[PDB]
Ligand binder design. Sequence first.
Ligand SMILES: *[C@@H]1O[C@H](CO)[C@@H](O[C@@H]2O[C@H](CO)[C@@H](O[C@@H]3O[C@H](CO)[C@@H](O)[C@H](O[C@H]4O[C@H](CO)[C@@H](O)[C@H](O)[C@@H]4O[C@H]4O[C@H](CO)[C@@H](O)[C@H](O)[C@@H]4O)[C@@H]3O)[C@H](O)[C@H]2NC(C)=O)[C@H](O)[C@H]1NC(C)=O
Ligand SMILES: *[C@@H]1O[C@H](CO)[C@@H](O[C@@H]2O[C@H](CO)[C@@H](O[C@@H]3O[C@H](CO)[C@@H](O)[C@H](O[C@H]4O[C@H](CO)[C@@H](O)[C@H](O)[C@@H]4O)[C@@H]3O)[C@H](O)[C@H]2NC(C)=O)[C@H](O)[C@H]1NC(C)=O
Ligand SMILES: *[C@@H]1O[C@H](CO)[C@@H](O[C@@H]2O[C@H](CO)[C@@H](O[C@@H]3O[C@H](CO)[C@@H](O)[C@H](O)[C@@H]3O)[C@H](O)[C@H]2NC(C)=O)[C@H](O)[C@H]1NC(C)=O
Ligand SMILES: *[C@@H]1O[C@H](CO)[C@@H](O[C@@H]2O[C@H](CO)[C@@H](O)[C@H](O)[C@H]2NC(C)=O)[C@H](O)[C@H]1NC(C)=O
Ligand SMILES: *[C@@H]1O[C@H](CO)[C@@H](O[C@@H]2O[C@H](CO)[C@@H](O)[C@H](O)[C@H]2NC(C)=O)[C@H](O)[C@H]1NC(C)=O
Ligand SMILES: *[C@@H]1O[C@H](CO)[C@@H](O)[C@H](O)[C@H]1NC(C)=O
Ligand SMILES: *[C@@H]1O[C@H](CO)[C@@H](O)[C@H](O)[C@H]1NC(C)=O
Ligand SMILES: [Ca+2]
Ligand SMILES: [Ca+2]
Ligand SMILES: [Ca+2]
Ligand SMILES: [Ca+2]
Ligand SMILES: [Ca+2]
Ligand SMILES: [Ca+2]
Ligand SMILES: [Ca+2]
Ligand SMILES: [Mg+2]
Lengths: 680, 913
Amino acid sequence: GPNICTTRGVSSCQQCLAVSPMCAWCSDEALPLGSPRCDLKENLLKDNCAPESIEFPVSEARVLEDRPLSDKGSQVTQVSPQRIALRLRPDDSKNFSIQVRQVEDYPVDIYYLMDLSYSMKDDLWSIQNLGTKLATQMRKLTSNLRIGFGAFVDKPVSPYMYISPPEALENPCYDMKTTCLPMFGYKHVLTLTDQVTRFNEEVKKQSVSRNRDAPEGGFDAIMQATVCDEKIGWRNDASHLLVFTTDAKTHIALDGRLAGIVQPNDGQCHVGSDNHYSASTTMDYPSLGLMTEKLSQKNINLIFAVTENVVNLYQNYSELIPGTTVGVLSMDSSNVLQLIVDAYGKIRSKVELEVRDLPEELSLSFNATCLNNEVIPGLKSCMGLKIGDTVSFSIEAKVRGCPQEKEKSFTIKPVGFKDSLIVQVTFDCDCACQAQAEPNSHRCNNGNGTFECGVCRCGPGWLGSQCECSEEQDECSPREGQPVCSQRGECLCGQCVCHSSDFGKITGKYCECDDFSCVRYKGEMCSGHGQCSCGDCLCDSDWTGYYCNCTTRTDTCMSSNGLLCSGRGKCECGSCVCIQPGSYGDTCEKCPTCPDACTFKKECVECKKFDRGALHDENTCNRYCRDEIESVKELKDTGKDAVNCTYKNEDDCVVRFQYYEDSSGKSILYVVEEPECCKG
Amino acid sequence: LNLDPVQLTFYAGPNGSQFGFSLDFHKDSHGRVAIVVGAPRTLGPSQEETGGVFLCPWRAEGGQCPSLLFDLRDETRNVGSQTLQTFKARQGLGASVVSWSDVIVACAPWQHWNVLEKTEEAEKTPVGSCFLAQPESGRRAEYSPCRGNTLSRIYVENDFSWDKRYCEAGFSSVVTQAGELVLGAPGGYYFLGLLAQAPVADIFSSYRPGILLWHVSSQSLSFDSSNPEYFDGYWGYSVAVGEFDGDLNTTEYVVGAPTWSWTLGAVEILDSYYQRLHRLRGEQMASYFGHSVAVTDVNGDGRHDLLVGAPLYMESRADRKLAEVGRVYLFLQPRGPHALGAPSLLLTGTQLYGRFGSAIAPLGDLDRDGYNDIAVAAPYGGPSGRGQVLVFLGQSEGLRSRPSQVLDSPFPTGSAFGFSLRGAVDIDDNGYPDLIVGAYGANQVAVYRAQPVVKASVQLLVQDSLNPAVKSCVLPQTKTPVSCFNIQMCVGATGHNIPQKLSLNAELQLDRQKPRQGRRVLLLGSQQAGTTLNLDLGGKHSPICHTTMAFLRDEADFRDKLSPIVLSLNVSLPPTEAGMAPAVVLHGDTHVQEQTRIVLDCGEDDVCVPQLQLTASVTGSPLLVGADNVLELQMDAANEGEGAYEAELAVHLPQGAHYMRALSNVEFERLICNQKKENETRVVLCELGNPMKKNAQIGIAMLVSVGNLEEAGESVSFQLQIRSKNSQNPNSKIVLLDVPVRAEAQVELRGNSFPASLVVAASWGPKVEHTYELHNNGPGTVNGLHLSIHLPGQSQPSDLLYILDIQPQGGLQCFPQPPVNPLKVDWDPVLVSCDSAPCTVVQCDLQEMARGQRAMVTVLAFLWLPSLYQRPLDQFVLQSHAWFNVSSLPYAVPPLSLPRGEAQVWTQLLRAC
Ligand SMILES: *[C@@H]1O[C@H](CO)[C@@H](O[C@@H]2O[C@H](CO)[C@@H](O[C@@H]3O[C@H](CO)[C@@H](O)[C@H](O[C@H]4O[C@H](CO)[C@@H](O)[C@H](O)[C@@H]4O[C@H]4O[C@H](CO)[C@@H](O)[C@H](O)[C@@H]4O)[C@@H]3O)[C@H](O)[C@H]2NC(C)=O)[C@H](O)[C@H]1NC(C)=O
Ligand SMILES: *[C@@H]1O[C@H](CO)[C@@H](O[C@@H]2O[C@H](CO)[C@@H](O[C@@H]3O[C@H](CO)[C@@H](O)[C@H](O[C@H]4O[C@H](CO)[C@@H](O)[C@H](O)[C@@H]4O)[C@@H]3O)[C@H](O)[C@H]2NC(C)=O)[C@H](O)[C@H]1NC(C)=O
Ligand SMILES: *[C@@H]1O[C@H](CO)[C@@H](O[C@@H]2O[C@H](CO)[C@@H](O[C@@H]3O[C@H](CO)[C@@H](O)[C@H](O)[C@@H]3O)[C@H](O)[C@H]2NC(C)=O)[C@H](O)[C@H]1NC(C)=O
Ligand SMILES: *[C@@H]1O[C@H](CO)[C@@H](O[C@@H]2O[C@H](CO)[C@@H](O)[C@H](O)[C@H]2NC(C)=O)[C@H](O)[C@H]1NC(C)=O
Ligand SMILES: *[C@@H]1O[C@H](CO)[C@@H](O[C@@H]2O[C@H](CO)[C@@H](O)[C@H](O)[C@H]2NC(C)=O)[C@H](O)[C@H]1NC(C)=O
Ligand SMILES: *[C@@H]1O[C@H](CO)[C@@H](O)[C@H](O)[C@H]1NC(C)=O
Ligand SMILES: *[C@@H]1O[C@H](CO)[C@@H](O)[C@H](O)[C@H]1NC(C)=O
Ligand SMILES: [Ca+2]
Ligand SMILES: [Ca+2]
Ligand SMILES: [Ca+2]
Ligand SMILES: [Ca+2]
Ligand SMILES: [Ca+2]
Ligand SMILES: [Ca+2]
Ligand SMILES: [Ca+2]
Ligand SMILES: [Mg+2]
């Protein structure tokens, strides 16, 4: 029957394909004069079009490399498939899966970026034997391990450093009894080495210095630590933990103007044989974005080990910087050993995907599948995992129109890992019968048009099936009463020829279709997220709605909790719509008048254990309820680090338990073993 | 829009001097405009960087400039036990420059300074300093308000309070029209930041050579703080002045603190006594919101508007979560004492690491269209990264989202093209303000000149219908009767300082839409389908009209009689002569098309006279004040007369209304509508038919979003009419719709107990909390909200509950009666409720509550065991009750219903063994 293919582009084979992914073209010269040449494949066949003459390419995704994932990190593969040859047609999409999986016992590197300003003097004393003690614990998590050390204060220049009296330049602790080192921006100390004992040897040789302002040049350190590959000695196939201990703020780009420094940070390594950041006094601090780029490229997981006073600051930095984690350091850094162990397990709890070098013409959509088979659309991240677990992501790649450049490529990659999936894209927009074209053909009125794919493409002036008439009586409208060519063209040779326009192109059998009359959002046609086609916006892969301004993403909708919009709340266009009565916030995380978890949400000893109540015939029993059911028996902490309570069970007995929050959020139950009943 | 990008003027300074780090226009007493340019690494006398200041005179060719002489020697003066020392090495003279009247002010932010006294010292610190100069007299002066003579020991004893040692005064600078030099010193008060103000006249008169430490009586500085939010905020990283309080006598300061509140960033507006009027918070951490500030009235209503720069602002991208580009924020100043709300516009850079918004320059009215314009700088913008400067023109609603002109850096990589900018000044006296752009990395300054803007007007007048059967002309020379008709075309050209010898070409095309050899009408003289005219508009204040005569071809010579005959008029400037160099810029209406047609179905008089009818109504009529209303205009248009040519519906929108979408019942489904803001008011025009045939009747449904209009009144008026191009009876009657406006509010009260259930064992009993929450969801704001909570018992030894504490939040204040917690301290079912026993009524008050705003009160208590074990086998249920209401809503005419309601919280007690 009638469709988008027939009643639009019936001029050439290429236009036909550009109309829609479902349009096929028939080049058979024997085709009855009248039947639609551009139609669905099924319809062309029903008019006995020669199968080999049918032009109908289909988009595909051929897997080139498909090495299975490794079971033990002892070459290791953590991303499968590794390479895929994608091939798309005009305005068409294609989906494909990727499987990320963190191998167990993968090698680990640990560089220790340490603030060594005056307040961190006591921190050196408590770190004296870290390294060997760090090894002992790390040997459980990995078989291969190398560790290194770095140190930093701030840019050695006024007003960051004291410059009087002349003795102060030799010893910043001049007015104090003790004597400390001259000020340094950042110095490398110990290259990543297998000898853990040498770390301890070097830490005792270190000492602090002093400076004026509270903020520090830690981001200068972090930059150099990242970009100086060969000096630090990061392994290619290994986890890269960068431990950043500090007890104060950090300087950002544009702060250097106060020290007369404006030259922007170049993201280059400037630490020669003397192991000092030489450009400290001449170049500005790095910006947040420039540092984040290098962290990503070098697959570094930056750990913010900072004191409580300044935790919220660095936690807010970790929000912007992917692959990072924060750890509450004590004022003497006496708990750093455990902080790293916890950070490693936390960093590896999450698997986030990052796209790299994606061409403008392409757009991507993600659906995530984490633990169980709970598919979460619009998500490219899974959390609450353990080392060894495996997950998969469904990725869709749509193209807009048809790019001139015939071949393009990009890389989907997990954050902080070397392994990746390279996607080679190819655009198939041309018909095969174009190659066998025939210009100035005898078939088109003694060379007044090119004959390709069973049709005359007439040159300027002439129209018709063989380019007969030039200028000198047929239906140029749907009905008799309706006007001619929608007053947008001229019915010349029984065929609408549309007028030109300053805004774009006017097409169609009756010049009814436009290319620039679509709806605008903010001075942007289809919100700049879709191509205009006959008045209607065709949105890209990751945008929906009549305006193409509602994202498919649900990254911003999820919270630290685990589920989308904390508890209840429909995610819409990257923003939650809170349903739970009385709940509010960005992710519906805030709810003062919610019935406390220790009341209604006690179904974890009801739905699963001793099955009873709701969620029996509906798939949501252990969806919300998925906490750690630890069977501890009356610990000495009856209501302090959580929200404990008790209720009356089925047989009139008390049941004691506790779960709420320790630091940020810990969903771990502590229900008792044996109940205590009553006779009457 | 009209800066000359080809004919630029380049001034250059010494290599490595950073010439063009700062700049400003300077006007001498005689009126001539010159350019002050700062070069903060110019070498001094002792072969060391001290900075320098040049004064470039205006030459079209540009070149090398002379320098202003300044004392670059170090001073040492012994006063009693103390020894004063100034250190000008790497002081950065010219790091900021600013002109006022016949005075130039150049500062050295990093000029160090120290005071020695026996063993002790005041520490060698960058206090900053400014040099003042009056070229024509040769007078000099200095200003350095952060110099003190307190020793290092005293600051330590007072926890570094009021510590001006690291000021770096002159980092930013600005001078008022009254002549008050305002210096920004972001390092002041231990890197909190401070401002130093003093009148220029007093700085000169107070100055004494050989006296390093002195005070300028009439100066005034900002204050210190113990608030953590301000620590390391660099308050005064930038500065500006304007009018934001209404009183023209006073002048208001605008200050940038780009790392305020843990690098969140902030911009504050203060009065002359440094009291905060507004504070604008940064959107994103580490974005350096407040790096740049500018003040100008962009929307042309008299009131100054504020622009803020955040050069390190990051946006999201497919392959980049943290895509640093930069962002500029626009805040329009509203009427009265209303606070500056959310940004009226957001401009965001497109190039990665471009630093869009590091400089923002008011340009004045660059194109003389009535609205002031700005220039924004991206020192590393453009695909190359070499740097860009984008111009944005002023409009009725603030600024255009898209730039009218983009200036690419003419210097090599790393020049920092656009790190400093100044406009608003006519340097070549042509009547249009110009732009100077610094590029300190290239040690140069570029100068762009504004070209005169010619506003073209075009008009085309022709008959609405042509009758072939009437032949009143004959083809020249021959005598072949032809149906002829006049065509008038009028072209005008306006603008300031446009050349007295100005001309334009005017091309006229008949039957444009038809092919070359299908043109149904031709000119009587040449018998061609078009001609070009050379109109002399030189000095002609009026537009020029010229009429020609066309004619319709023989009846049998063409078939198409229905299609309309389109006439077009295209106006352009002639080409430039050998050597190029175009003088003016031509904008406005330079192209226009009108049409005519052959007579058809107009009756025996061959003159179509329509009877256009229009009826209308509105659905969803009650417009909610402070809401996101979406009306739907339903209107039926009909013609009971003869054909109406170019028929179209014309809906005049009110101030708040915006066209969304339109539909019709024909089976054409969607209408071809075009919102025209050209008319004094916002008008929407949808095509009804060409022609709109006899007995044609179109129903139209149009969605219209009536946005936030707080000063609309009791109702808003819509006006609708059908228009046509016919000579007789062209338009329908004017239908007016008065949609009423009323404010509504919906406050919700919720409650719950914590815990819900509570079992008891065999000093203090178990705790219980009852928490109520209020939430204004509805559109309207509510004032005078009173909440009254009823709690059972009066915390007596005979009562069951003992009330510990009441914890209200969200600006809510409560008063219990009787008092709660009379002691010290930190923080069948028996129905125990306030109806049974005595009661503690807690009453609260809230003065105002905005949309989406919340407020909660938590009541803490615990059971009194002795009372509880009276009746040792009962099942208790503790009940509380809460009532609430609202006094009024702050609006013009809101006759609906004041919010009210009630809530109730239960807590059950259970028996355990
Ligand atoms: C993307 O851009 C679009 C367009 O610029 C933005 O859409 C606007 O959104 C606002 C805020 O939601 C909306 O305001 C309306 O206020 C009305 C007050 O009377 C509400 O009644 C109305 O709700 C209806 O429309 C919503 C939006 O479509 C629906 O989600 C909602 O369910 C309501 O639907 C009723 O009305 C529709 C009529 O379309 C009808 O089909 C239904 O049956 C139902 O009766 C709105 O909240 C504006 O009207 C919107 N503008 C337009 C042109 O529609 C949007 O905010 C942007 N989104 C993002 C993510 O940027
Ligand atoms: C790290 O980021 C978090 C999250 O952004 C941030 O906590 C947030 O701080 C902001 C700013 O203080 C809070 O926003 C407040 O919103 C309320 C209304 O909801 C406003 O009234 C506040 O304005 C002032 O009014 C208050 C009067 O009581 C003052 O007490 C307050 O200080 C304000 O001056 C304000 O805008 C927001 O509530 C929190 N959000 C959360 C979840 O805590 C935190 O500060 C950041 N830490 C850093 C950067 O170190
Ligand atoms: C990610 O998951 C989402 C959500 O499931 C997927 O979107 C859905 O895609 C399917 C494709 O089969 C759509 O199916 C359609 O359903 C409609 C029902 O109205 C039916 O009429 C069609 O015939 C068709 O079967 C489904 O509508 C769509 N969900 C929507 C639009 O809300 C998406 O495909 C997944 N993307 C990736 C990259 O994995
Ligand atoms: C994404 O593409 C994949 C191709 O591997 C599809 O996988 C299967 O497709 C077949 C045929 O349509 C379906 O019958 C199966 O349901 C799919 N298998 C599985 C395991 O899901 C898949 O249909 C596509 N998915 C999406 C969301 O687009
Ligand atoms: C396209 O076809 C037209 C029409 O057949 C050709 O016009 C002919 O031109 C030749 C001279 O070159 C004349 O002798 C004929 O009388 C013309 N034909 C007619 C029907 O009048 C034209 O040559 C063709 N164009 C091209 C580029 O080959
Ligand atoms: C300016 O000096 C720098 C540093 O020595 C040098 O690289 C550059 O070539 C010089 N430029 C010119 C124009 O002499
Ligand atoms: C008017 O328009 C035509 C094409 O639209 C253009 O080529 C021509 O130069 C213009 N002529 C004048 C006089 O403006
Ligand atoms: Ca410490
Ligand atoms: Ca410091
Ligand atoms: Ca004032
Ligand atoms: Ca204004
Ligand atoms: Ca203007
Ligand atoms: Ca000028
Ligand atoms: Ca008539
Ligand atoms: Mg420190």
